[PDB]
Amino acid sequence: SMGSRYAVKLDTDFDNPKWIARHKHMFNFLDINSNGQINLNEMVHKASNIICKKLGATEEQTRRHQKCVEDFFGGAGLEYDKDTTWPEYIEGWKRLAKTELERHSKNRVTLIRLWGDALFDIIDKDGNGSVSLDEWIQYTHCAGIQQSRGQCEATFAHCDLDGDGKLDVDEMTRQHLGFWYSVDSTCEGLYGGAVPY
């Protein structure tokens, strides 16, 4: 949406209702039994036993992806064999967003970039660090985070695509920094409304 030389927004906007609504939407989504809590075991079950198995990851790809998911949700305060409720979750996410943006400001790779690298190694069949529209539909619909083809098309329309019409991990990482962490207006619309704003 801003080209490849766009400088990431590095400050936070945690009291913005759009930020709150994005994470409340995801919390309710992840709270599969609607009991008001989630844990890391559930996140990793989803990641390894559903997403990686169905999308054809090798055992080693699955292991790498799982460590990235552990680290990402662990950075928001989730733990194995311990349950997390919404107020705790959203406070933990303020801490995650802050430490991720701080990492980026210091040229240290982010947990969300490491996750993207691990996921794209599985779902990018050509191997150049970018995914086609059909690969992105398959991932997002298996994860459940997008549910219609039009939402995925909106993601591709929003993002700046490479020469081959594909979504590169560096672009999706920049978009994620602005969508999940800093509330950057230029990243609004990233999930085509499947996740709000």
Ligand SMILES: O=C1N2C=C(c3ccc(O)cc3)N=C(Cc3ccccc3)C2=N[C@@]1(Cc1ccc(O)cc1)OO
């Ligand atoms: O970003 C992504 N996600 C963010 C959250 C999420 C969850 C809770 C929040 O409060 C905020 C965000 N949940 C899921 C889906 C998922 C959840 C749990 C386990 C596996 C997958 C998810 N899938 C990703 C994976 C991804 C990562 C980097 C990329 O470059 C491209 C794709 O793309 O959409």
